[PDB]
Enzyme design. Structure first.
Site, short mmCIF file in Angstrom:
data_model
loop_
_atom_site.label_atom_id
_atom_site.label_comp_id
_atom_site.label_asym_id
_atom_site.label_seq_id
_atom_site.Cartn_x
_atom_site.Cartn_y
_atom_site.Cartn_z
N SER A 1 8.01 4.21 0.45
CA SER A 1 6.99 3.45 -0.27
C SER A 1 7.12 3.71 -1.78
O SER A 1 6.97 2.79 -2.60
CB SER A 1 5.59 3.86 0.19
OG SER A 1 4.58 3.15 -0.50
N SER B 1 0.84 -1.19 0.00
CA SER B 1 0.00 0.00 0.00
C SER B 1 0.87 1.23 0.00
O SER B 1 1.83 1.32 0.78
CB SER B 1 -0.93 0.02 1.21
OG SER B 1 -2.02 0.90 0.97
N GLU B 2 0.54 2.18 -0.87
CA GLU B 2 1.39 3.32 -1.15
C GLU B 2 1.51 4.24 0.06
O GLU B 2 2.55 4.86 0.29
CB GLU B 2 0.90 4.07 -2.41
CG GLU B 2 -0.43 4.81 -2.24
CD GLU B 2 -1.28 4.81 -3.52
OE1 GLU B 2 -1.57 3.70 -4.02
OE2 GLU B 2 -1.65 5.90 -4.01
N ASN B 3 0.47 4.29 0.89
CA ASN B 3 0.58 5.03 2.16
C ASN B 3 1.58 4.45 3.17
O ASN B 3 1.80 5.02 4.24
CB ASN B 3 -0.80 5.23 2.82
CG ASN B 3 -1.48 3.91 3.20
OD1 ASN B 3 -1.53 2.97 2.42
ND2 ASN B 3 -2.04 3.87 4.41
N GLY B 4 2.20 3.31 2.83
CA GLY B 4 3.41 2.85 3.52
C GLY B 4 3.22 1.56 4.31
O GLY B 4 3.66 1.47 5.45
#
Ligand SMILES: [Cl-]
Lengths: 466, 469
Positions: free
Chosen positions: A332, A290-293
Site C-alpha cells: 500500500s 486506503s492505506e491499510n491496504g
C-alpha cells in the site's frame, strides 16, 4: 511448519526483553489468541513492533494493561487512553514511526536489505531527530530520537532508514492448509504479511485449517517457508472498534468535491476530504485507496453488510465497490510512496507559503503519531490538496510564512481549499489566489493570511458542487 | 485503465532511446504480441530492461535481430547466439545485473525507494566495477561498469544499488477483468509483476478478459492502479524452449549420492542445474523436501509426463516441470526477498573454483563464458543459508579447483560452507579455512593434498565418504 493445538505452547519460549512484531491494523487482523497466551506466560520488557496499540482493553492494549511492554514501535496511537497515559507518564517508550516506513523497514528486515532511502519524514522530527521516545516523571524528556542521515538522489532529498527484524512475530491470518501455506481475508492482511517474513520465529494463528490443495497455488499469500509455527485460534470475538452503519464546513466540502475527476485514484483523509466523496457524481468513477491496504472503497455498510475484517484508515467499518482489491501494508505504501495515487486530500493545522505542512502534532497536547500522513505527501507526482478553515482561534493564522507546529512535510502541498479562498501553491513562487468566495475581497484574505500572495488574473468566484 | 483492441496502437508512442521494461523469464511470461507490435513500429535505440534475451528467433531476441535495442539490462543471456554475437562484436551494450538485484531495483523504482543496500555482488565485478558493458570493434573494452559504494551494516559488507524505472513497461499476464485488475498463471508471473509498477506507462497484454467480480479481491495480483493500458493478445504460440519429459559416469554419480545426504526432512532447498538437482532423485519418499525455484515457485516436483506438460510452468533451467501438492507461485522480487533474506535452508550449486575461505567462482570464464550470473550471486549472499558446492575435485591436467585464491571472476566472497567432490568432503570456514571431514575409500590425505591448491586441517573424526543408494 510445526502445528500446535495450544497457543501458550506456541509462544512459551519468548524471552524477556524480546522484540516482537504484532500483526494488525487497529483491531482488524490482530492475533488475539497469541496476545492472550502472552498474558498467561507473563513475558515482560518486550519491544513490541505493532502499527497501533489496539484499544484500552483489547489487542495490544491488554499487554500495556499488564505492563509487559517496555517499548512500542508504532505509527499511530489512536483510541487508547492507557497507551497515551503510560507514554506521557514516562512508563512506556514509544518510537513514533511513519506507517509506510514501518512497513518498508519490516519488509527490508525479511528481504535481506539492511537499509534503504525514502523521502517520508524528511524535514520533520523523524529526519532531524528530537522526537520524544521516553518522558521523565517530572515531565521533561528522557530519551529523544536520533537523526536520520540525509542524502540527495536526482535533485531530491531522502533519509536513510534501517531494517526492522524481530525475535518473534505474532501473526493473524484467515486460513492455513495442512502444509503451512496461509491466506488473509479482506483488510485483515495489513501488517501481518510483511511481519511474517521479518522474524527469527514466526507464529501464526488462523481461523480455519483446510486441506492441502484447497488454495490455488497462485493465490497463496504467505508461502509455508515463512510460517514456522501454526495454531488454530480457539476464540475469535470479531470485535469492531467503530461501527459506522448506513440507512462553513459544508462550503469547503462542496469545493473539495470539485477536485475529483473521472478515473481518478484518490486517498482521502478523515473528515472533510472523505465527506467530499459523497458529492461525486454517479456518472463519475473515482477509485478510493486506503492505506491499510484496500483499493476501491465504497460507502459505509448497511447493518447486514458489517464486517470486522473490512475497515477504512479511520478504523471505521466500510464496504468495497466492484473491482476492488486488497493488499499488504508494505505494498500500500509502495503504491502511495511511488506516486501512483493521483490525489491525496487531507486536513491541516498549518500550511506555509511554499507548501510545508503541519497536521500530526501539537506538542504537549496532540502526540498520537503521524500515521501514513508523512508518506501521503512524500511524492511529487501525487497532487496534495489541503482542506481546512482559513483561520484559527482569535483569527490566528493557519496559512503563514513558516509553520510553527511540527512538520508533516516540506514543500508538499499543491493546493489549499478554505471557506474563504482557494490557493495554488508553488515550491518556488509561493501562493496564488485562484478562487475567492463571494462577498469577500482580496483585502479580507490578506488580513486572514500570514504571508503575502500573488493574485491570479483569472480569479473566479469560488465554485460549489451541489 | 484504457482498453485497446490493437497492440500497435497501444505502443505506437514509444520514443527512440526509451527505456522499456520487458516481462519474462526465458520464454515463460513474455509479452509476445507487444514485442511483435514493436517490430512493426520500428522504434529504435531502446534500453531494454529484461531478465533474459529470449531465444535467437523469439521473445526479446526478435528485437535484437532487428537491431532496435541499444542497451540490455539483464541477468542471464542463455541460449541466444545472436545476443552473444552482438555483445562480443561491440554492437550491443549489456549491463549484466544480478537477477535478485534487478528485481529489487525494479521494485524500488515503483515503490519510491531511490536506493537500497544488498550483499549480492560484494567482492565481485558488480561491486568493484570493470564489468564489460560495451566492447570495441578491435575487441577491447569500450565501456566498463562503475563501482558500487560499499557500506558496513551489523558487521557485514553491503553495496548500494539504485532504483530502475522505465518510460514504458511491456507486461504479459493471464487474465484481466473489465476494471483493469490482472492475474498471472503459474511461473509466468516472474518479472511481470514488479515491472508493472516501475514505469511511467505500463502496457499489459492478456490471454483472456473476464467480467468484473470474476476475481476474488484478495487474489488480484496486480491491482488496476498499476495497469495503464490493457490489450487482449491476438496470438499466443505457447512456445517451449526446453521440452523435458519423464517416461552420467560413476564419478559424477559418486558426488550426486553424497550430495543427496545433505537433504533433511522439512528442508527448504534451492538446487542448481546438474548434480544438485539430480541429487533430489535420491531423496527418500518418507523425507519431505520443499524445492524453491528462483523464477518464483516453491514446491517443485518431477518432470512432467507428456500430458502434464505446460508452457507456463518451468524451472530455473528453463525446463518444463511439475509442482507437488501445497506448492505456491510468486513474483521474482518476492522470490529473491525469500532467497536474499536467508529463508531457504540449503543452496546447492556447482562451481568452477572455490577458495580456502569460501570464495566462489561459477558464472564467468573471460573470453569464453559470458552468459551472465543469473541468480547465482543472490543465492550465496545470505549467511543464514547453508551454501554447499558440488564439483569434480580437479580440472584438466589435474589443475586445481580448490585453491588459495580464485583466478576466475567471483560469484561471492566467503560464501561456501561445504565442498563435496568425488574424492573428499570439506567444511569451509571464513576465518579458519578448510577441514577434511570425509574421505573417499582407497584415497589418502596425501592424495587430497596434491589435488588441492591450498592447505587444510584434517578432522579428528574423519570418516569414509558416505553414499545414499
Ligand atoms: Cl493508523
Amino acid at each position: 511448519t510445526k502445528f500446535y493445538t495450544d497457543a501458550v505452547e506456541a509462544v512459551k519460549d519468548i524471552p524477556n526483553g524480546a522484540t516482537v512484531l504484532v500483526g494488525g491494523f487497529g483491531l482488524c487482523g490482530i492475533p488475539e489468541n497469541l496476545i492472550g497466551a502472552l498474558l498467561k506466560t507473563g513475558v515482560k520488557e518486550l519491544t513490541a513492533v505493532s502499527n497501533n496499540a489496539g484499544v484500552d482493553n483489547f489487542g495490544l492494549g491488554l499487554l500495556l494493561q499488564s505492563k509487559q511492554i517496555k517499548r512500542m514501535i508504532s505509527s499511530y496511537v489512536g483510541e487508547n487512553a492507557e497507551f497515551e497515559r503510560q507514554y506521557l507518564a514516562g512508563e512506556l517508550e514509544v518510537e513514533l514511526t511513519p506507517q509506510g516506513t514501518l512497513a518498508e523497514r519490516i519488509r527490508a528486515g525479511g528481504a535481506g536489505v539492511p537499509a534503504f532511502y525514502t523521502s517520508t519524514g524528511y524535514g520533520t522530527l523523524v529526519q532531524e531527530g528530537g522526537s520524544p521516545i521516553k518522558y521523565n516523571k517530572d515531565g521533561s524528556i528522557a530519551i529523544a530520537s536520533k537523526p536520520r542521515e540525509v542524502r540527495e538522489f536526482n535533485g531530491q532529498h531522502f533519509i536513510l532508514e534501517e531494517a526492522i527484524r524481530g525475535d518473534f512475530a505474532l501473526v493473524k491470518a484467515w486460513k492455513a492448509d495442512q502444509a503451512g501455506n496461509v491466506t488473509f481475508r479482506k483488510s485483515a492482511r495489513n501488517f501481518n504479511l510483511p511481519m511474517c517474513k521479518a522474524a527469527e520465529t514466526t507464529v501464526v494463528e488462523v481461523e480455519e485449517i483446510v486441506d492441502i490443495g484447497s488454495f490455488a497455488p497462485e493465490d497463496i499469500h504467505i508461502p509455508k517457508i515463512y510460517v514456522h509455527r501454526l495454531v488454530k485460534g480457539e476464540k475469535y470475538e470479531k470485535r469492531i472498534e467503530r461501527l459506522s452503519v448506513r440507512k462553513v464546513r459544508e462550503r469547503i466540502i462542496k469545493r473539495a468535491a470539485l477536485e475529483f475527476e473521472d478515473g481518478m485514484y484518490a486517498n482521502l483523509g478523515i473528515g472533510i476530504p472523505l465527506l467530499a466523496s459523497n458529492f461525486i457524481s454517479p456518472n463519475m468513477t473515482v477509485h478510493l485507496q486506503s492505506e491499510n491496504g484496500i483499493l476501491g472503497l465504497g460507502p459505509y455498510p448497511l447493518q447486514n453488510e458489517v464486517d470486522a475484517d473490512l475497515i477504512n484508515a479511520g478504523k471505521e467499518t466500510v464496504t468495497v465497490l466492484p473491482g476492488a482489491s486488497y493488499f499488504s501494508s508494505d505494498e500500500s505504501f509502495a503504491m502511495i510512496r511511488g506516486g501512483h495515487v493521483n490525489l491525496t486530500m487531507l486536513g491541516a493545522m498549518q500550511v506555509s507559503k511554499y507548501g510545508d505542512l503541519a497536521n500530526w502534532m501539537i506538542p504537549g497536547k496532540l502526540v498520537k503519531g503521524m500515521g501514513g500522513a508523512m508518506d501521503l505527501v512524500s511524492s511529487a507526482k501525487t497532487k496534495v490538496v489541503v482542506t481546512m478553515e482559513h483561520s484559527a482561534k482569535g483569527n490566528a493564522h493557519k496559512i503563514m510564512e513558516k509553520c510553527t507546529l511540527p512538520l508533516t512535510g516540506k514543500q508538499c502541498v499543491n493546493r489549499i481549499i478554505t471557506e474563504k479562498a482557494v490557493f495554488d501553491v508553488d515550491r518556488k513562487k509561493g501562493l496564488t489566489l485562484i478562487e475567492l468566495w463571494e462577498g469577500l475581497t482580496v483585502d479580507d484574505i490578506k488580513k486572514s493570511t500570514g504571508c503575502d500572495f500573488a493574485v491570479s488574473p483569472k480569479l473566479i468566484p469560488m465554485q460549489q458542487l451541489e
